[PDB]
Design a protein around this ligand. Structure first.
Ligand code: CLA
Ligand code: CLA
Ligand code: CLA
Ligand code: CLA
Ligand code: CLA
Ligand code: CLA
Ligand code: CLA
Ligand code: CLA
Ligand SMILES: CC1=C(C#C/C(C)=C/C=C/C(C)=C/C=C/C=C(C)/C=C/C=C(C)/C=C/[C@@]23O[C@]2(C)C[C@@H](O)CC3(C)C)C(C)(C)C[C@H](O)C1
Ligand SMILES: CC1=C(/C=C/C(C)=C/C=C/C(C)=C/C=C/C=C(C)/C=C/C=C(C)/C=C/C2=C(C)CCCC2(C)C)C(C)(C)CCC1
Ligand SMILES: CC1=C(C/C=C(\C)CCC[C@H](C)CCC[C@H](C)CCCC(C)C)C(=O)c2ccccc2C1=O
Lengths: 221, 86, 665, 253
C-alpha cells in the first residue's frame, strides 16, 4: 500500500485486511482524497441500507403515510408509489433531508480526519484501546460490508423494477397479506406433512392374518 | 438546624458518637459518671435529625435528645446534594 | 447422611433458627419477628451448605404440597363431582366438583347443576382438562388421585432425606450448566415429547370418540383422522369449538424436538455469543438473582397463558364455558403481577447482598427518563378519559375522543392470524369472534402501558437505589427491610427496597384491576353472547356492545361496568347460587376498608393506647410477661398491604363470578 | 504447585488431571494454601487428605457417588478465554471506560465501542461522558442553538426563539380547538397562540426579575438586562411567527 492508502486499510475487501482496488483509483490519491472517498462510500452505504429497508417496507404494503395522505391504497411497487404520493409529501421529504444535510455539513461538520463521523463519536470513543471489548474495527467493517451489499441490492431492485416491473415483492404474510392456506405460507405445501414425493414403506412386513393381542402399528395418514 | 442536647444521665458509652452519621458528637472528660466521660454535641450545625444517637442511647430514657426544627432547616441539616446554598 | 441429628427437641424452641431471637419472648414483636424471618434461610444460623440444604428441601416440600392439592382436586372430581353428567352433556350441566354442608342453612349455597347433583359451580376448567387428557371414568380419576398422593409422599420423603443427604461439600446445586442442560433436554424436551406420545396414544382416540358421540367401554379401552389441511387455529372443532387435539399433540412433539435440538447445539457449543452474557453469568450466580429471574420469567409466562387460554381455544368446551375462561384469565393475570413484583423484590435483595451490575452506575438517567415517560403516559392516557368526561358533561360529544368524534385509530394493531371472515359458534354461543379495535381500545391499551410503566418505575427505583442514594449513603448498611433512616434530612420514610415493593404491589394491583375490568367488559360487550339467525347472524352480547360507546368515559366505566354489572352480586342474597358471592362481596369491602387502618395510622398511637389499656390489666393483676407491643412499622405496612389487596381482589372476584354465573345460567 | 501437599499426585478417580488444572486456574492463587469452606478446591483438599496413595484406597459406592456429585466437572469451570474476557471487562470498568452498549428488547446489545465514561472531573456526576450530550455533533448543535450561539445579540436570540415558538404554537389551536370546524378557526388559533406567547413571555419576565440571570448582560449593565431584552424580543418574535403562520394558512388554504 501507500501512506495515504493506509488511512483506511483494514476496512475493505472480502476479509478486512484486503485492499480491493482493481481499477487502482486510490493508488495516486492523497490521504485527504482517500478519506473523502471513504466518506462518500459510507454515506452511500448508509443511504442504501435505509433505502432497502424502506423499499421492502413499502413493497410489503405498509405504506401508511401515503395511504392516509392520498385517501387511497397506494401501489405496492415503490416506484409507482413515488408517483402516487402527493407533491406535498414529496417536497416535505426533500426539504427534511436537505435540512439534515445542512445541519450535518455546516452546523455540526464532521472532523477533517474522520469525515464519516457524523455523530461525533471521535470525542468520547477510544478506538486505540487494547482491551478485548474494543471491536470497533469489527463494527466498522460490518457497517461497510452491509452498506456495500445494500448499495448493490438497491441498485438492482430499482433496475429490475424499471425493466421488468419486478420490485422484489416481499411475502411477509402477516398483516398486509392475508395468507389463507399452508400452501400460501410455505410454497409447495398442501397438508400437515412435508411435500415429499417419497412414500415411506414399512421397514418390516406385517402379518396378513392377525392374532389376538396384536396392536398393529398406527398410521400417521 | 436541629438542637442536640445531652443530659447528665449520660454514662459515656460512646454509642451515640459511634452511630453519628455526620460526626456531630464527641466524648469529653467528665466526673459525673463512672466512665468519666460524657458525649457532647459541638457540631450541631451538621446534625441531620436521623435520631440514630437516640436509637443507640441505652439509658432508660434518652440522655441525648434531638429536637427537630423544621423552620430553621439548613442545607447541612437537609442533606442537600444537587443544590447548594453556600 | 447422618440422621441421628434430626430430633424433635428443637420443635419446642420456637426461634432456634434466628440468633436475634435468642432472648425468647420478651415482647410480641418477638413472635412477629419469628414469623417474619422463619423462611429467611440466608440470615439464619448455620452455613452456606445449610442454606442450600434448606432451599432445596423446602422446594421439595412445596412440590409435595402442590401434589397434595392436585390429588385433592382429582379426588373431588372423582367422588364429589358431576363429571359424568358434564361429559355426556357439557352445555346443559355446569361443572361442579364442590359441595357444601347444610349446617346453618348453608345448604342454600349448593345450586342446581344437574338433575341428581347440587353444589357449587367450579371455574378452574378441571373438567375440560380431564376431557382433553381423556379421563372419562371414575376409575381413571381415582388412579390419577392415587398417583398425585404417591407423588406427594415421594416429594415429602425427598425433602426429609435431602435435609441430611446434602452435606457441606454438596455442590450439585451450583452446576448451572448441568442444571440448565438437564432441564432443557429432559424436563422440557423429553417431557413435551412424552406428553405428545400420551396425547396421541390415549387422548386422541377418546376425544375423537367423544366428539362423534360414542361412549362404548371397549372403544374407550390413525392420527390426523379428522383434521383437514386447514392451518391449525384457522379451523376449530365444529362439535367442540377448540383446536384439534391432534394438532396439539403435533405441537408438543415439535416443541420437544426443538428443545432437544437447542440443548444439543448448546452441548456442542454451536451458540457463540457467550461473552455478551458472561458478565451476567458471573454476577447472577446467586439465590436471589435466580429467584428474581425465574419469578419474572414465570410472571410473563403466566400473562401469556392468561391471554392465550382465552384467545386461542385448546380445551374442549372451555370456549363456551364463559366463567371458566374468565376465571382462568383473571387468575393467571393476577399471578403474573404478583410474580413480577416478586422479581423486583428479589432483584433488590440480590443488589443488597451482592455486587450489582454496571448499569446501576448511570441509574439517574434511567429512572429520570422512566419518570418522564410515566408522567407523560399517565397525563395523555388518563387525560383523554378526563377530557371525554368533561366535554360530554358540558354537552359537546363532537369534541370528545371517540369513534364518532375525534378518533384515535390503533394503526399498528394489525392482524396476523389471517382468519376467514365471520365468527365461530357452538350451540347458541360464540366460541370465537374477532375483537375489533378502536378509540376505546387505543385509550385502554395506553392506560395499561402507563400503569405497567409506573409499577416498573417503582420496582426499578427500589432496585437501583438500594445500596445508596443522594439522601442516605449507607442504605447498604441499613439493609433490605428497614422502616426508614429517621425524621432527618426532611424525613426518610420508606426509602428501603422493601417499602419500594410495598408500593409497587399497590401499583401492580391497580394495573391488574384495570386489566381485569378491560378484559371483562370487552369480552362481554364485543365477543361473548348468543346469536339469532350462507347465513348471517345478529349477535346479542351480554353487555350489548356498550364498551365501544361507554368505555370512553370514566363515568361510563363507573356506570355500565361497576354499577350496572354489580346487579347480580348486589342482588344475590335470595338466590341459592350466588348468595355466598354476595356475602363475600360485602366482606371483601369490609376487609379492604379495614386495611386503611394500618395503611394510614402509625405505630406510636397504638403503642400508647396499648400502654393505657395495659394499665388496667396491671391494676387488676393481669400481668402479661410477653409485654404487648404495637406492630412494627414494616409489619403495619405489610398487614395493610395484604388486607388492601385481598379485599380488592375479593370484591372483583365475587363481582365477576356472580355476573358470569347468573348470565350463563 | 509442588509446594502444595494435597495437590501432589491426586488420584485420577478423585479428580481428573485436566479438571484439576482448570479448577486451580479458576481459583485465585492465594486460596490454594487453605481454600474457603464452600469451594470445590476445599472439597478436593479435604478428600485428598483422606484418600489416595498411602491412605484409604477404597470408598463405599455411595460415598464415591456423592464425591463425584459434589466435585466439579470440566465444563462447569470458566475457560481461559472466558476468564480473560471477564478480567478485561472488570479492568475497563475500573479504569473508567465503558464498553458501549444500548438497551434493546429485554436486554442490551454491545456496539463494540469503548468510550470514556468518566469526564474531566472524575468525581463529578455531571461530567460523565455520553454521545447524546458530549459527542461532537451534540456539542456543536447545542452551542449553535439560539440560546447559545456565538456573536448573537439578546434581541436576535429572543427574536429567533419566539419566531419558532409562535409559528408552531398557532397550529394546535387551529386544528384541534373548539372552533376548529368554524370559518374563524385559523384566526382563533392565532389569538390563542399569541396568548400563549404572551403568557410564557410574562413567565420569563418574572424569571428574569426574580433570579436575574446575567449571562447575556453586557459589561457594566444592569443585571438581567440582557435576559429581559431577550424575553421581550421573544414575545415580539412569537407574535410575528404566529401571524406569519396564520397568514400562510389563510393564503394557501
Ligand atoms: C459510492 C460508491 C462507493 C465509493 C465512493 C467507494 C469507495 C471506496 N471503496 Mg468501494 N464499494 C462500493 C461502492 C463504493 N466504494 C460498492 C457498492 C461495493 C460492493 C461491490 C464496494 C466494495 C468495496 C470493497 C470490497 C473495497 C472497497 C474499497 C473502497 C475504497 C478504495 C477503492 C476505490 O477506489 O473505490 C472507489 C470507488 C468508486 C469511485 C466507485 C466507482 C463505480 C463505477 C463507476 C461503477 C458504478 C456502476 C454501478 C454497478 C451502478 C450501475 C447502475 C446502472 C446500471 C443504472 C474507496 C474508499 C476498498 C477499501 O475500503 O479498502 C480498505 C475495498 O477493499 N469498496
Ligand atoms: C446483491 C444485489 C443483487 C441481487 C441479489 C440480484 C438478484 C437478481 N438479479 Mg440482479 N442486479 C443487480 C444486483 C443484484 N441482483 C444490480 C446492481 C443490477 C444493475 C446492473 C442488476 C440488474 C439485473 C437485471 C437487469 C436482471 C437481474 C436479475 C436478477 C436475478 C438473477 C437470478 C436469476 O436469473 O434468477 C435476481 C433476482 C434478472 C431478473 O430475473 O430480474 C427480475 C435480470 O434480468 N439483475
Ligand atoms: C387442596 C386441598 C384440599 C382442599 C382445599 C379440600 C377441601 C375440602 N375437602 Mg378435602 N380432600 C383433599 C384435599 C383437599 N380438600 C384430599 C387430598 C383428599 C383425599 C385424596 C380429600 C378428601 C375429602 C373428602 C372425602 C371430603 C373432603 C371434603 C372437603 C370439604 C370439607 C372439608 C371439611 O369438612 O373439613 C373439616 C375440618 C377439618 C378436617 C379440620 C382440619 C384441621 C384439624 C386439625 C384436623 C372441603 C371443601 C368433604 C366434602 O366436600 O364434603 C361435601 C368430604 O367429604 N375432602
Ligand atoms: C428436584 C428433584 C430432585 C433432585 C434435583 C435430586 C437430586 C439428587 N438426589 Mg434425589 N430425590 C428426590 C428428588 C430430587 N433429587 C426425591 C423426591 C427423593 C425421594 C424419593 C429423592 C431421594 C434421594 C435419595 C435417597 C438420594 C438422592 C440423591 C440425589 C442426588 C442425585 C444422584 C442420583 O442418584 O441420581 C440418579 C437419579 C442429588 C443430590 C442421592 C445422593 O445424594 O447420593 C449421594 C441419594 O442418595 N435423592
Ligand atoms: C408440528 C407443528 C406444529 C403444530 C401443529 C403446532 C400447533 C400449535 N401451536 Mg405451535 N409451535 C411449533 C410447531 C407446531 N405448532 C413449534 C416448532 C414451535 C416452536 C417451539 C411452536 C411454538 C408455539 C407457541 C409458542 C405457541 C404455539 C401454539 C400453537 C397452537 C396454536 C397455533 C396457531 O393457531 O397458529 C396459527 C397458524 C399460523 C399463524 C400459520 C403459520 C404457521 C407457520 C409459521 C408457517 C397449536 C396447537 C400456541 C398455543 O399453544 O396456544 C394455546 C402458542 O402460544 N406453538
Ligand atoms: C427476566 C426476564 C427476561 C427475559 C424474558 C429476557 C429475554 C431476553 N433477553 Mg434478557 N435480560 C434480563 C432479563 C430477561 N431477558 C435482565 C434482567 C437483563 C439485565 C442484566 C438482561 C440482559 C440481557 C442481555 C445483555 C441480552 C438479553 C437478551 C435477551 C433475549 C435473549 C434471546 C434472544 O436474543 O433470542 C433471539 C435469538 C435467536 C431475550 C429477548 C439479548 C438481546 O438481544 O437483548 C436485546 C442480550 O444480548 N438480555
Ligand atoms: C393571555 C393573553 C395575553 C397575554 C398574557 C399577553 C401578554 C403580552 N402581550 Mg399580548 N396579545 C394577546 C394576548 C395576550 N398578550 C392577543 C390575543 C393578541 C392579539 C394577537 C396580542 C397581541 C399583542 C401584541 C401585538 C403585543 C402584545 C404584547 C404583549 C405584552 C404586553 C406587556 C408588555 O409590554 O410587555 C413587554 C414585553 C405581553 C408579553 C406586546 C409585546 O410583545 O411587547 C414586547 C406587543 O407588542 N400582545
Ligand atoms: C407579514 C405578515 C402578515 C401577513 C402577510 C398577514 C396577513 C393577514 N392578516 Mg395578519 N397578522 C400579522 C402579520 C401578518 N398578517 C401579525 C404579526 C399578527 C399578530 C398581531 C397578525 C394578526 C392578525 C389578525 C388577528 C388578523 C389578521 C388578518 C390578516 C389578513 C388581512 C390583513 C390585512 O390586509 O390587514 C390590513 C390592515 C392592516 C391576512 C391573511 C385578519 C384575517 O382576515 O384573519 C383571517 C385577522 O383577523 N392578522
Ligand atoms: C470499489 C471499486 C469498484 C467499484 C464499484 C461498484 C460496483 C460500485 C457500486 C456502487 C453503487 C451500486 C452504489 C449505490 C448507491 C445507492 C444509493 C445511494 C441508493 C439510494 C436510494 C434511495 C434514495 C432510494 C429511495 C427510494 O427507494 C425508497 C427508499 C423508497 C421508494 O418508495 C422511493 C425511492 C425509490 C425514491 C471498482 C469499479 C471495481 C473500481 C475500484 O477498483 C474498486
Ligand atoms: C426531531 C424530529 C423532527 C422535529 C421537527 C421540528 C421540531 C420542527 C420545528 C419546526 C418549527 C418550529 C418551525 C418554525 C418556523 C418558523 C418560521 C418560518 C417563522 C417565521 C417568522 C417570520 C417571518 C416573522 C416575521 C415577523 C416578525 C418576526 C415580527 C414583525 C412582523 C413579521 C411578520 C415581519 C421531525 C418532525 C422533523 C421528524 C424527525 C425528528
Ligand atoms: C391497628 C394497628 C395496630 C394495633 C394492632 C395490633 C396490635 C394487632 C393485634 C394483633 C392480634 C392480637 C392478633 C390476633 C388476630 C385477630 C385478633 C383475629 C381476629 C379475627 C376475627 C375474625 C375475630 C398497630 O400496632 C399498627 C402499627 C403500625 C401501623 C399500623 C398499625 C395499626 O393500624
Amino acid at each position: 500500500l501507500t501512506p495515504a492508502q493506509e488511512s483506511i486499510a483494514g476496512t475493505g475487501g472480502p476479509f478486512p485486511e484486503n485492499f480491493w482496488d482493481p481499477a487502482g483509483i486510490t493508488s495516486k490519491k492523497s490521504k485527504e482524497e482517500i478519506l473523502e472517498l471513504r466518506a462518500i462510500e459510507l454515506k452511500h452505504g448508509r443511504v442504501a441500507m435505509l433505502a432497502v429497508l424502506g423499499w421492502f417496507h413499502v413493497a410489503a404494503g405498509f405504506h401508511i403515510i401515503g395511504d392516509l395522505a392520498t385517501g387511497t391504497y397506494l401501489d405496492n411497487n415503490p416506484l409507482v408509489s413515488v408517483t402516487q404520493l402527493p407533491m406535498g409529501g414529496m417536497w416535505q421529504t426533500v426539504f427534511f433531508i436537505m435540512c439534515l444535510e445542512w445541519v450535518s455539513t455546516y452546523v455540526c461538520p464532521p472532523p477533517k480526519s474522520k469525515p464519516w463521523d457524523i455523530l461525533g463519536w471521535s470525542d468520547i470513543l477510544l478506538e486505540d484501546e487494547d482491551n478485548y471489548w474494543n471491536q470497533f474495527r469489527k463494527a466498522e467493517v460490518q457497517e461497510l460490508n452491509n452498506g456495500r451489499l445494500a448499495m448493490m441490492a438497491i441498485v438492482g431492485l430499482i433496475v429490475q423494477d424499471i425493466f421488468f416491473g419486478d420490485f422484489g415483492e416481499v411475502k411477509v404474510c402477516f398483516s398486509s397479506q392475508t395468507c389463507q392456506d399452508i400452501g400460501d405460507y410455505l410454497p409447495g405445501w398442501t397438508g400437515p406433512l412435508p411435500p415429499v414425493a417419497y412414500d415411506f414403506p414399512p421397514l418390516y412386513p406385517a402379518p396378513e392374518v392377525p392374532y389376538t393381542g396384536y396392536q398393529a402399528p398406527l398410521k400417521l395418514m | 438546624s436541629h438542637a442536640v442536647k445531652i443530659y447528665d444521665t449520660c454514662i459515656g458509652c460512646t454509642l451515640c458518637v459511634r452511630a453519628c452519621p455526620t460526626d456531630v458528637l464527641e466524648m469529653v472528660p467528665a466526673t459525673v459518671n463512672a466512665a468519666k466521660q460524657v458525649a457532647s454535641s459541638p457540631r450541631v450545625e451538621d446534625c441531620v435529625g436521623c435520631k440514630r444517637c437516640e436509637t443507640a442511647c441505652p439509658t432508660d430514657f434518652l440522655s441525648i435528645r434531638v429536637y427537630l426544627q423544621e423552620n430553621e432547616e439548613t442545607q447541612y441539616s437537609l442533606g442537600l446534594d444537587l443544590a447548594d446554598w453556600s | 447422611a447422618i440422621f441421628r441429628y434430626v430430633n424433635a427437641t428443637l420443635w419446642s424452641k420456637a426461634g432456634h433458627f434466628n440468633k436475634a431471637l435468642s432472648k425468647g419472648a420478651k415482647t410480641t414483636t418477638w413472635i412477629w419477628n419469628l414469623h417474619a424471618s422463619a423462611h429467611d434461610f440466608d440470615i439464619q444460623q448455620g452455613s452456606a451448605g445449610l442454606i442450600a440444604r434448606k432451599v432445596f428441601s423446602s422446594g421439595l416440600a412445596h412440590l409435595s404440597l402442590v401434589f397434595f392439592w392436585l390429588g385433592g382436586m382429582h379426588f373431588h372430581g372423582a367422588y364429589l363431582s358431576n363429571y359424568s353428567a358434564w361429559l355426556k352433556d357439557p352445555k346443559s350441566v355446569a361443572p361442579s366438583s364442590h359441595i357444601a354442608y347444610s349446617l346453618v342453612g348453608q345448604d342454600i349455597l349448593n345450586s342446581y347443576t344437574s338433575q341428581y347433583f347440587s353444589g357449587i359451580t367450579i371455574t378452574s376448567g378441571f373438567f375440560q382438562l380431564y376431557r382433553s387428557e381423556g379421563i372419562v371414568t371414575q376409575s381413571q380419576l381415582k388412579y390419577a388421585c392415587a398417583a398425585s398422593l404417591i407423588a406427594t409422599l415421594i416429594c415429602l420423603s425427598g425433602s426429609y432425606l435431602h435435609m441430611q443427604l446434602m452435606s457441606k461439600f454438596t455442590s450439585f446445586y451450583k452446576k448451572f450448566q448441568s442444571l440448565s442442560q438437564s432441564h432443557l433436554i429432559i424436563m422440557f424436551g423429553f417431557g413435551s415429547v412424552s406428553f405428545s406420545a400420551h396425547q396421541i396414544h390415549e387422548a386422541l382416540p377418546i376425544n375423537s370418540l367423544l366428539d362423534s358421540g360414542i361412549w362404548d367401554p371397549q372403544l374407550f379401552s390413525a392420527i390426523l383422522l379428522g383434521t383437514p389441511s386447514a392451518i391449525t387455529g384457522k379451523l376449530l372443532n365444529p362439535s367442540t369449538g377448540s383446536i384439534f387435539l391432534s394438532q396439539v399433540a403435533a405441537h408438543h412433539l415439535a416443541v420437544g424436538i426443538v428443545f432437544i435440538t437447542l440443548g444439543l447445539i448448546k452441548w456442542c457449543n454451536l451458540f457463540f455469543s457467550r461473552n455478551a452474557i458472561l458478565s451476567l453469568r458471573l454476577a447472577y450466580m446467586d439465590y436471589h438473582a435466580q429467584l428474581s429471574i425465574n419469578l419474572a420469567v414465570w410472571a410473563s409466562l403466566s400473562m401469556v397463558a392468561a391471554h392465550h387460554l382465552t384467545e386461542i381455544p385448546v380445551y374442549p368446551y372451555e370456549s363456551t364455558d364463559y366463567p371458566t375462561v374468565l376465571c382462568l384469565f383473571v387468575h393467571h393475570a393476577c399471578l403474573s403481577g404478583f410474580f413480577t413484583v416478586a422479581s423486583g423484590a428479589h432483584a433488590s435483595i440480590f443488589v443488597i447482598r451482592q455486587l450489582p451490575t454496571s448499569e446501576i452506575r448511570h441509574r439517574d438517567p434511567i429512572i429520570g427518563h422512566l419518570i418522564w415517560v410515566c408522567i407523560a403516559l399517565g397525563l395523555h392516557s388518563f387525560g383523554l378519559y378526563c377530557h371525554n368526561d368533561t366535554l360530554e358533561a358540558l354537552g359537546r360529544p363532537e369534541d370528545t375522543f371517540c369513534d364518532n368524534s375525534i378518533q384515535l385509530k390503533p394503526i399498528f394493531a394489525k392482524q396476523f392470524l389471517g382468519l376467514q371472515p365471520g365468527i365461530e359458534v357452538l350451540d347458541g354461543k360464540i366460541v370465537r369472534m374477532t375483537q375489533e379495535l378502536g378509540t376505546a381500545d387505543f385509550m385502554v391499551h395506553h392506560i395499561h402501558a402507563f400503569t405497567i410503566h409506573v409499577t416498573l418505575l417503582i420496582l426499578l427505583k427500589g432496585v437501583l437505589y438500594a445500596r445508596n442514594s443522594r439522601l442516605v449513603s449507607d442504605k447498604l448498611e441499613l439493609g433490605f427491610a428497614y422502616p426508614c433512616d429517621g425524621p432527618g434530612r426532611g424525613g426518610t420514610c420508606q426509602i428501603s427496597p422493601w417499602d419500594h415493593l410495598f408500593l409497587a404491589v399497590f401499583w401492580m394491583y391497580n394495573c391488574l384491576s384495570v386489566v381485569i375490568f378491560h378484559y371483562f367488559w370487552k369480552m362481554q360487550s364485543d365477543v361473548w353472547g348468543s346469536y339469532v339467525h350462507h347465513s348471517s347472524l345478529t349477535c346479542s352480547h351480554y353487555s350489548q356492545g356498550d364498551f365501544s360507546v361507554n368505555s370512553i368515559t370514566i363515568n361510563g366505566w363507573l356506570r355500565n361496568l361497576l354499577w350496572s354489572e354489580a346487579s347480580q352480586v348486589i342482588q344475590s342474597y335470595a338466590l341459592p347460587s350466588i348468595c355466598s358471592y354476595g356475602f363475600i362481596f360485602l366482606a371483601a369491602h369490609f376487609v379492604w376498608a379495614f386495611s386503611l387502618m394500618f395503611l394510614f395510622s402509625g405505630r406510636a398511637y397504638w403503642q400508647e393506647l396499648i400502654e393505657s389499656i395495659l394499665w388496667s390489666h396491671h391494676k387488676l393483676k393481669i400481668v402479661p410477661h410477653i409485654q404487648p407491643r404495637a406492630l412494627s412499622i414494616s409489619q403495619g405496612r405489610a398487614v395493610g398491604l395484604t388486607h388492601y389487596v385481598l379485599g380488592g381482589i375479593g370484591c372483583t372476584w365475587a363481582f365477576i363470578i356472580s355476573r358470569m354465573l347468573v348470565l350463563t345460567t | 504447585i509442588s509446594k502444595i501437599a494435597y495437590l501432589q499426585d491426586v488420584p485420577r478417580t478423585i479428580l481428573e488431571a485436566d479438571v484439576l488444572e482448570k479448577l486451580l486456574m479458576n481459583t485465585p492463587r492465594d486460596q490454594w494454601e487453605d481454600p474457603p469452606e464452600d469451594t470445590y478446591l476445599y472439597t478436593l483438599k479435604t478428600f485428598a487428605e483422606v484418600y489416595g496413595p498411602g491412605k484409604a484406597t477404597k470408598m463405599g459406592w455411595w460415598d464415591y457417588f456423592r464425591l463425584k456429585l459434589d466435585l466439579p466437572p470440566g465444563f462447569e469451570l470458566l475457560d481461559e478465554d472466558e476468564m480473560k474476557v471477564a478480567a478485561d471487562y472488570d479492568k475497563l470498568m475500573m479504569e473508567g471506560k465503558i464498553p458501549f452498549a444500548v438497551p434493546g428488547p429485554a436486554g442490551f446489545w454491545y456496539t463494540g465501542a469503548v468510550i470514556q465514561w468518566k469526564g474531566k472531573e472524575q468525581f463529578a456526576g455531571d461530567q460523565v461522558q455520553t454521545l447524546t450530550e458530549n459527542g461532537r455533533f451534540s456539542k456543536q448543535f447545542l452551542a449553535n442553538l439560539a440560546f447559545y450561539r456565538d456573536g448573537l445579540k439578546p434581541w436576535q436570540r429572543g427574536l429567533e426563539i419566539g419566531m419558532a415558538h409562535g409559528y408552531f404554537l398557532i397550529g394546535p389551536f387551529t386544528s384541534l380547538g373548539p372552533l376548529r370546524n368554524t370559518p374563524e378557526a385559523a384566526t382563533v388559533g392565532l389569538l390563542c397562540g399569541c396568548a400563549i406567547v404572551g403568557l410564557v413571555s410574562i413567565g420569563g419576565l418574572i424569571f428574569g426579575s426574580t433570579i436575574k440571570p446575567t449571562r447575556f448582560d453586557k459589561e457594566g449593565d444592569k443585571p438581567a438586562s440582557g435576559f429581559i431584552e431577550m424575553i421581550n424580543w421573544h414575545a415580539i418574535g412569537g407574535l410575528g411567527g404566529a401571524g406569519f403562520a396564520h397568514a400562510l394558512i389563510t393564503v394557501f388554504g
